[PDB]
Every structure is written in structure tokens, then in C-alpha cells.
Curated annotation (Swiss-Prot), chain C:
Residues 1-72 form the U-box domain. It is found in: Nucleus; Nucleus, Nucleoplasm. Homotetramer. Component of the NTC complex (or PRP19-associated complex) which is associated with the spliceosome. Keywords: Developmental protein, Differentiation, DNA damage, DNA repair, mRNA processing, mRNA splicing, Nucleus, Repeat, Spliceosome, Transferase, Ubl conjugation pathway, WD repeat. GO terms for biological process: cell differentiation; DNA repair; mRNA splicing, via spliceosome; nuclear mRNA surveillance; protein K63-linked ubiquitination. The gene is prp-19. The chain holds residues 1 to 131 of 492 of the full protein. This is Pre-mRNA-processing factor 19. One of its GO terms (cellular component) is nucleoplasm. It comes from Caenorhabditis elegans. One of its GO terms (molecular function) is ubiquitin-protein transferase activity. It comes from the Eukaryota.
Swiss-Prot record, chain F:
Belongs to the SNW family. The lineage of its organism: Eukaryota, Metazoa, Ecdysozoa, Nematoda, Chromadorea. It comes from Caenorhabditis elegans. This is Uncharacterized protein T27F2.1.
UniProtKB/Swiss-Prot annotation, chain H:
This is Pre-mRNA-processing factor 19. It comes from Caenorhabditis elegans. Probable ubiquitin-protein ligase which is mainly involved pre-mRNA splicing and DNA repair. Core component of the NTC/Nineteen complex which is part of the spliceosome and participates in its assembly, its remodeling and is required for its activity. Together with emb-4, necessary for interaction of rnp-4, a probable exon junction complex component, with mRNAs and spliceosomal snRNAs. Plays a role in nuclear retention of unspliced mRNAs. Disruption phenotype: Enhances sterility conferred by rnp-4 disruption. Combined with emb-4 knockdown, leads to accumulation and leakage of unspliced ama-1 and tra-2 to the cytoplasm, severe growth retardation and arrest in larval stages, and loss of interaction of rnp-4 with pre-mRNA and spliceosomal U snRNAs. It comes from the Eukaryota. Residues 1-72 form the U-box domain. Homotetramer. Component of the NTC complex (or PRP19-associated complex) which is associated with the spliceosome. It is found in: Nucleus; Nucleus, Nucleoplasm. Belongs to the WD repeat PRP19 family.
Length: 60, 95, 131, 67, 279, 34, 101, 99, 121
């Protein structure tokens, strides 16, 4: 019961800090995640064109 | 819309002088200073009003505030109009 | 490419590392920098064409990037950051307890103050009657 | 032994603060703040990018950068 | 310049003022090396009432010019803008910040505005501080121009004694003043310089109360006068009477004795005789 | 170049709206086929 | 002393001298006191948590959607890079077949 | 400067690069790889612990907490559930390699 | 060798000594202490991150290690709570002691004044 009182106390401090900064850092996280996805989609488009070129070179 | 009659109206040198006289009569010092200091901020005060303001503070014996009342007056006007403020400021300080 | 050059502030397509560097440079940046400066943009070490190595990605075996945010390293990291905080908190609590406990031990005059009052009042009870 | 004097002193102190016994032990303001300051440094250090986003709103739609 | 000002003024006649603001921001990019473009921009924001932009404009101007090459005409302009707002705590801060990095040359402008600023709000403690510190640097300018200006040293020493300045600083100022020995070596020029030593001995005796150091002031004085050409009988008299206040007649007689031995002069004989008559 | 005047001096009075300042028809054809 | 002093009978008492059933009452109420402080904290913690869950859930739902998209894209890139390398190696074998036929 | 390890796929606080490949690694992981195999993990060239260049720019900052991660026991719950997925993923790989 | 950190009272994998006191710390704690307090934690002298001198230097089961973390974390938090509880008790004992002292001064003041009456009866 003494130990749980501190876990809850640290939880309160964490939640109060989370309420200041989570809304931004989640937005910051999502921006980096969108950067990864658009870079990956750029790679997907580039390789799909490369695959279709090999078909064209073979057909030619 | 900023209709000119009320929009001008606070530039009221006759009325500011009447307001200041009532605060000397009934205001006590600290409210009277605020009224004159606002009259300076507006640039409504005449050099006579700066000298009246200082004489009020001098008659109360806030002599140091009188000197800055002159000083602030000197920032407000330019020559020739400052000349009577300098005359009164420099003699009053000197005594 | 996702690496951003530390000098130009824009994304690379030709990342380069050298043994005296640490921030990333572009190949098309550093070679002209060697020609004009000859000097490392950040550490000011001497630059030479044999130092530069160029980075690559997508080779065989390369692990997929974990994007889920949770990971074992990051959880062990923040649990470590919790522990550091709690020990530095406990240390300043233990320090304050030691100081408060110390001075109240020194302040234990109660029994000796009482004897002085007894000595004073017993004087008063004679002084009250010799008049 | 010191235990007797400690016991009597503690018992009187507890008894004087008897109406406070039901209250939880406090967290000192110094200790609460030093937890938060360490958390702001080591965990939420990404706030450096928050002011960069605020900086970007100043660099866009405003004045010249140094020369 | 005039092309941008005419384009700005054109948009102001339409009252486009945010488009006029765009012109200024581009104008400062090309031209902004000149301070006046920043001050005119901030004045444009102030007069329209954008005052948050005006603070930003000055603060960015300071950041633009830097930390070391402080463009202080910006800094005064920034200070006086905040004074006009009634931010006056900020206005002191800007002036006071400027005084540190600027300290000798450019402060001459800061102090004239800073002292006007304090002339209202300073009244007990702020006025006397800025005027004295203004006066202090103003006398130091006179000493850098001509260390032979004895009247500037006397007026400087008056200020520091009325300050009740820390003793070691007043000693450093007296000893700087004293080192300016007249180049002519004829007594007509020494008549003002000699009181630059007497005041030092009076300060050491009356204010510092370090009598063993006032001996050294007089010995240093008498080791500097060209006695075989002329003497100041005042020095020999004052040095003699000082040792009598130390109850050392043997020293006092030696002083007056070498006075007559080096330069027998009527003022010395009268003083020595009047002393021995009192004794 | 980071702090000095912006961070030293104090703050002014307000976070208001001037302190916020931050730089402050046709027809259409009917659709295909129809 | 901090182990020995527990309240009973509306006073502070030595725990060891009490009757056994009075020790049970004292320790029970001491337990319920601490569990009361936990419950006072837990209800406050749950309250702030519930606010954060709805406040942050939109940002989390965006991140969850991006993770599903990113997993799909990178597994497609994986298969495409496999297909590139076999068709390239197959294209070499077909070129030899041209010379043979 | 955000970097991720080629061995683990996680972020790294201490990125390092081999002189015989373009790929980047977390230092303690690649050193253990070198300590067992003496070779580059991706190009299979011979590699030694001194053939490493340190990408000593600022490492990747901590991920934000999940809302359930705001308490120490729920981090331990989260760490346990994370570990079970990592273990089963490793078990799925050796199954897939047999298949 | 086993080295014990003066801040935590626990073994450290990276023992460090501070020249401003000669006490041994975990590098990570003392850097965080310096980065917050700027001082030696034991001698209270000025300390900085360049002044630290470095000292020289199997698993069981993952559920077992996680259960050790659980039980150990409850022990660390029990320590943190009991410190706060003991700190307030120390403050309550102290304020009572000062109250006994100040009341004793009132008594000694009162009695010493009343003892003047016997000289003027
Ligand atoms: O030389 P003396 O006939 O004894 O005259 C002295 C002497 O004047 P000299 O300039 O001719 O020497 C003093 O001058 P100093 O040597 O001290 O410069 C002078 O003192 P002041 O210059 O301070 O006037 C003093 O006059 P006093 O006693 O009024 O100070 C005056 O004495 P007499 O009044 O006897 O002429």
C-alpha cells in the first residue's frame, strides 16, 4: 500500500507532464511518420518503374 | 465607425483643465497626478498646465515630482514654448 | 534521401562520412569544400579524398525499421530514466530528513529547560516569602 | 538509552498533530519541481523542436535573417 | 532607397498597410545594412498600432546586427520606443544593457537618453546614479583628451569624494592626477598643480585616516618639487604640522630644518618661528 | 546569437491580439453526358 | 518507533501492548487509510487519463493508420525488389537463349 | 539526426558505420557481431572493430509515452507484452526459414 | 570489483569519482545531478562534467527478470514513500520542539520578571 501510493504519485506527475507535451510530440511523431511513408511511397514508385523497364528491355 | 465629434472629443484642453482643477479641489494628490500625467500622454497640456501641475506638487511639497513634471513638459514642447518651463525649472531647482 | 545535410540543411542524395567528420555531407558539397577550404566544415580537420566513404541502404539482410514506437530498448531506457529521477528525489529527501533529524536531536533541551524552571520557581517561592 | 526520550518526544509531536494524521505525507515543492525539471530535460527534450516550429512561424511571414 | 520608399508610400495612399508591410520586409532584406531602414520600419509598425511587430522589428534588428558590433542607435531607438509605450522597466533594461557592452565611446548617446529617462522615474536613486556615472565618464573623457587639465581632475575628485567612493578607487584617481607634473618647470604653472597633492594629503589624513600613508604623500610631494629653483612653503609647512599632529617634534623639526637648508624662504622662517613659539 | 534582449529584459503587458499580430463567382457547366 | 507507534482507542499507542483483536482493528484501519489515499489518487489519475485518451486518440488513430499503410508499402517494396533481381537474372539467361536459338 | 540500426531496425543513440559498407549500425550490436563473425553483416567483407567511423551527431530522442505507459507497473506490463511479440517474431523467422 | 555509488547506495557498472569530494558515484546520476544542481552532492562544492575521473571495472529467465524488476521497483518506491513519511514526522517533531522551546522562553521570561517583585515589596 505504501509502494502503490508512490506509483500513483509518479503517475500523476507523468500524466501532468504528458498533458503539456504529448499533444505536440505526438504531432511531431506523426510528421516524421508521414515523412517515412512518403519516402517509402517514393521508393515504391521508383522500383515499380524499374520493374516495368526490365519487362520492356526483355520484350524489346 | 470613428465619428469625428466623439473621436476628437478627448482632445479637450478646456475640459482637461476643468477636470484637473476639480482633482486639485477634491482628488487628493495621487489621483491628481494620474489626471495630469494622462494629460501629458494625450499632449493636451499647455506649458501653463505643466507649470500649474508642478506648482500643485510643489505646494503639496512633492518637490522632486515637480522637477520631473517640468522635465516631462520639456520633452513635450519645443522652443520658444519650452522657455518659460526652463525659466521656472532652473530657478526652482536652484533655490 | 532521408539524411539531411548538417551544413546546407537540405536532404541528401549522396551522403558522405569521413573519419574526422561527424555531421553528414553531400559528395557534391564536400569536394568543392575540399577544393576551396581543404578543411572539415565542423571539426576543422584536414580533408583528403581517401577519407570520404558513401552510405548505402537496402542491402540483403537489413532489418525492417520498427515504426510502432514501442520497443524494448526505449522502455528499458525510460525505466532507467525513472530510476535516475527517483534516486535523485530520494537523495534530496534523505538529505532533508538528515538535516531536520539532526537539528531536532540537538534541540532536545526539554528535560534541562524543565530543571531550570524548577530551579527558578523554587527561588521565586523563597523570594516571594523573605519580603 | 535514547529510545525513551525519542518515544516521548515523537508521541507528543504526533499527538499535537493528531488532526493531521489522516492526511497523506506531503511531497515538498523542491522535490516535486526537481522531478519535473529532470523529466522536461531527459524525456520531453523534443520541446527543442516545438520552438523550432514556433521559429518557422517567425521565419515565414516576417523579417530578415542576419547578415 | 528612394524607389522602395516611393513604393511603400504608394501602398500607404491606398491604405493597403499589410501590403506596405510586405514591401518593408523585402526592403530590409536588400538594404537592411542601413540602420535607418529598420528604425523607419519599426516606426511604421508603431504608428499603425501593430506594436507587437514593432517590438519584433527592434529585437530582430538587434539580433541582425549581432552581439558585438552593437548598432546602438537601434538600441536607443528600441529603448525610446519602449519608453513611449510606458514599458519603462524595459526601457531601463535596454539602456542599462547598452551601457555595459558600449561602455566608453557610444554610451555618450545612451547616457543623454538614459538620464532623461531616469529624470522622471529615477527620482531619488535613479537620477543621482545616472548623472554621477555620466559625470564620471565625462571627466574621464576630459582626462583622455588632456591629463594636464587640472581643473578637470579637481572637479572629478569632488564628485568621487561626494560619492563616498571606495578608497582604493579614489587613491587610483589621485595618483593618476598627480603624475601629470607640469612640463614648464616654472612656479606660475605649478600654482594649480600643487593643490592636487594637498587635497590628496587632506583626503589621506581626514577621510582615509591612514597617517602612515600621508607621510608617503608628502615625501613623494617634496621629492618632486624642483627645490633648487623654487619651493611651495605650504608643502613644507603642512608636512611639518602633520608630524606635530603625530606628536613627532623630531620629525617636524627635521622637515622645517631641511626646508630652510634647501631653500631659506620667509614663509618658512615665520612658520618655524611661530611653531617654536607655540612650543 | 541566441538570448540576450529577447530573454533578459522581462515581458511586456499582454498576449492579446496586437501582441498575437502574426502578419495580420462563376457558373459551372453541367457534367459529362448529362 | 515508526514501526511501533500506531493509533488505537482514539490515541497513539505502542502496537505490541494492545490486545490481539485490537491489533487487528488497528492494522485494518491503518490498511484502509492507505487504501483510501490510493483510491483518492487513482480516481484523480483515471480522470486525467480519460481526458488524455480522448485528447490524444485522434493523433494515435492517425499514427495507427500510417503504420498499417507503411507496413503494406514496405512489404510491397520487399516483393518488388525480389522480383527485380530474378527478372534481371532471368533476362541474362534469356539473352543466352537468344544466341542458342 | 535520426538514425536506425541495420541489425535491429530500432532507433540508435550511437550510430556507427563500417568502412567496408555503406550501412549504419548501433555500436554495441555490431561489435558483438564482429566479435562472433569478424565480418560485415551485409556485405560479408572482413571487418574489424577499428574499421568503424562514428556518426557522432545528436542521436534520436525518446519516443513519447503511450498513455498506458505513464505508470511504472504499466510500463512493466507493456514491456512484458512487447517481449512476447519480439520472442514470437523470432520464432516465426526460424519457422519461415525452414518453410 | 564492487563499487557503491554515494547517491544511490547501490552497485554501479560505471563507477566514477569526483575530485571535489573523493566520493564515488554512478556516472549517469552525477551528470544528472550536475546538470540540475551544479554541485558536488556530498561536499556541496562546485562541480562540472569534466572533473569526473573514471575508475576501472548471464541471465536467468525473462519472466523471472521481469518479476525481479517488479519486486525491486516496489522496494524503491517503498523507500521513497517512507522517506516522505519520515520527513514530515521529522518536521512535526521539530515544530513541536521549537514550540516547547518558545513556550519555555515565555515561562523563563515570565518567571524572571516576577522574580523582580521580591526586590520592591
Ligand atoms: O615668499 P614670501 O614673501 O614668504 O610670500 C609668501 C609666499 O609667496 P611666494 O609665491 O612669493 O613664495 C606664499 O606663496 P607660496 O610659496 O606658498 O606659493 C604665499 O602663499 P599663497 O601663494 O598661497 O598666497 C604667502 O601668502 P599667504 O600667507 O597669504 O598664503 C606669502 O606670504 P606673505 O603674505 O607674507 O607675502
Amino acid at each position: 500500500a505504501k509502494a502503490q501510493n508512490e506509483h500513483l504519485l509518479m503517475r500523476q506527475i507523468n500524466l501532468e507532464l504528458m498533458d503539456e507535451y504529448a499533444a505536440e510530440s505526438y504531432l511531431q511523431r506523426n510528421k516524421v511518420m508521414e515523412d517515412l511513408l512518403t519516402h517509402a511511397e517514393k521508393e515504391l514508385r521508383k522500383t515499380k518503374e524499374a520493374v516495368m523497364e526490365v519487362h520492356a528491355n526483355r520484350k524489346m | 465607425n470613428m465619428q469625428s465629434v466623439q473621436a476628437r472629443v478627448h482632445r479637450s484642453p478646456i475640459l482637461w483643465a476643468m477636470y484637473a482643477d476639480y482633482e486639485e479641489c477634491c482628488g487628493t494628490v495621487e489621483s491628481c497626478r494620474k489626471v495630469y500625467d494622462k494629460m501629458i500622454e494625450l499632449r493636451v497640456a499647455s506649458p501653463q498646465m505643466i507649470m500649474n501641475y508642478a506648482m500643485f506638487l510643489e505646494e503639496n511639497e512633492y518637490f522632486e515630482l515637480a522637477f520631473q513634471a517640468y522635465e516631462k513638459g520639456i520633452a513635450l514642447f519645443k522652443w520658444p514654448g519650452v522657455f518659460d518651463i526652463w525659466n521656472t525649472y532652473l530657478v526652482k531647482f536652484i533655490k | 534521401m532521408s539524411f539531411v545535410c548538417g551544413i546546407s540543411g537540405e536532404l541528401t542524395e549522396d551522403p558522405v562520412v569521413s573519419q574526422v567528420s561527424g555531421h553528414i555531407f553531400d559528395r557534391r558539397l564536400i569536394v568543392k569544400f575540399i577544393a576551396e577550404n581543404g578543411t572539415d566544415p565542423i571539426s576543422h580537420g584536414e580533408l583528403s579524398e581517401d577519407q570520404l566513404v558513401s552510405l548505402k541502404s537496402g542491402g540483403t539482410g537489413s532489418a525492417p525499421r520498427n515504426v510502432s514506437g514501442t520497443s524494448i530498448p526505449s522502455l528499458l531506457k525510460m525505466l532507467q530514466d525513472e530510476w535516475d529521477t527517483v534516486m535523485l528525489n530520494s537523495f534530496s529527501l534523505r538529505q532533508q530528513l538528515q538535516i531536520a533529524r539532526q537539528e531536532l536531536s540537538h534541540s532536545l533541551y526539554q528535560h534541562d529547560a524543565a530543571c531550570r524552571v524548577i530551579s527558578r520557581l523554587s527561588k521565586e517561592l523563597t523570594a516571594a516569602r523573605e519580603a | 538509552a535514547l529510545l525513551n526520550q525519542v518515544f516521548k518526544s515523537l508521541k507528543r509531536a504526533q499527538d499535537l498533530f493528531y488532526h493531521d494524521y489522516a492526511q497523506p505525507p506531503p511531497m515538498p515543492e523542491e522535490n516535486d519541481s526537481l522531478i519535473r525539471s529532470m523529466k522536461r530535460k531527459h524525456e520531453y527534450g523534443n520541446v527543442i523542436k516545438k520552438v523550432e516550429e514556433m521559429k518557422v512561424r517567425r521565419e515565414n511571414e516576417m523579417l530578415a535573417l542576419p547578415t | 532607397e528612394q524607389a522602395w520608399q516611393t513604393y511603400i508610400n504608394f501602398e500607404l495612399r491606398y491604405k493597403e498597410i499589410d501590403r506596405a508591410r510586405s514591401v518593408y520586409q523585402r526592403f530590409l532584406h536588400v538594404h537592411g545594412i542601413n540602420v535607418q531602414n529598420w528604425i523607419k520600419y519599426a516606426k511604421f509598425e508603431e504608428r499603425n498600432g501593430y506594436i507587437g511587430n514593432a517590438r519584433a522589428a527592434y529585437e530582430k534588428a538587434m539580433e541582425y546586427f549581432g552581439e558585438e558590433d552593437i548598432n546602438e542607435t537601434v538600441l536607443v531607438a528600441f529603448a525610446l520606443f519602449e519608453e513611449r509605450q510606458k514599458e519603462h522597466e524595459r526601457a531601463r533594461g535596454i539602456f542599462k544593457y547598452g551601457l555595459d557592452n558600449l561602455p566608453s565611446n557610444r554610451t555618450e548617446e545612451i547616457f543623454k537618453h538614459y538620464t532623461q529617462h531616469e529624470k522622471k522615474f529615477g527620482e531619488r536613486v535613479g537620477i543621482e546614479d545616472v548623472i554621477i556615472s555620466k559625470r564620471k565618464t565625462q571627466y574621464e573623457k576630459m582626462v583622455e583628451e588632456n591629463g594636464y587639465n587640472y581643473d578637470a581632475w579637481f572637479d572629478y575628485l569632488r564628485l568621487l569624494e561626494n560619492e563616498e567612493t571606495d578608497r582604493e578607487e579614489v587613491e587610483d584617481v589621485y595618483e593618476r592626477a598627480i603624475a601629470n607634473i607640469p612640463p614648464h618647470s616654472e612656479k606660475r604653472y605649478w600654482r594649480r598643480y600643487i593643490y592636487l597633492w594637498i587635497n590628496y594629503a587632506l583626503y589621506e589624513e581626514l577621510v582615509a585616516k591612514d597617517f602612515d600613508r600621508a607621510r608617503q604623500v608628502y615625501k613623494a610631494c617634496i621629492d618632486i618639487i624642483p627645490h633648487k629653483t623654487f619651493t611651495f612653503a605650504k608643502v613644507w609647512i603642512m608636512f611639518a604640522h602633520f608630524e606635530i599632529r603625530q606628536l613627532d617634534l623630531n620629525a617636524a623639526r627635521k622637515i622645517m630644518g631641511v626646508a630652510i637648508g634647501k631653500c631659506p624662504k620667509d614663509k618658512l622662517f615665520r612658520a618655524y618661528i611661530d611653531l617654536e613659539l607655540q612650543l | 546569437m541566441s538570448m540576450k534582449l529577447r530573454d533578459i529584459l522581462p515581458a511586456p503587458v499582454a498576449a492579446d491580439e496586437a501582441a498575437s499580430q502574426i502578419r495580420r463567382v462563376s457558373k459551372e457547366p453541367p457534367p459529362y453526358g448529362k | 518507533c515508526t514501526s511501533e507507534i500506531i493509533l488505537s482507542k482514539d490515541k497513539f499507542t505502542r502496537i505490541a501492548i494492545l490486545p490481539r483483536e485490537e491489533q487487528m482493528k488497528a492494522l485494518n484501519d491503518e490498511f484502509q487509510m492507505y487504501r483510501g489515499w490510493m483510491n483518492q489518487r487513482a480516481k484523480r489519475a483515471a480522470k486525467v487519463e480519460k481526458k488524455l485518451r480522448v485528447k490524444l486518440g485522434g493523433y494515435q488513430a492517425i499514427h495507427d493508420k500510417l503504420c498499417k499503410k507503411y507496413q503494406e508499402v514496405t512489404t510491397e517494396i520487399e516483393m518488388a525488389n525480389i522480383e527485380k533481381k530474378t527478372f534481371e537474372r532471368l533476362g541474362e539467361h534469356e539473352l543466352k537463349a537468344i544466341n542458342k536459338r
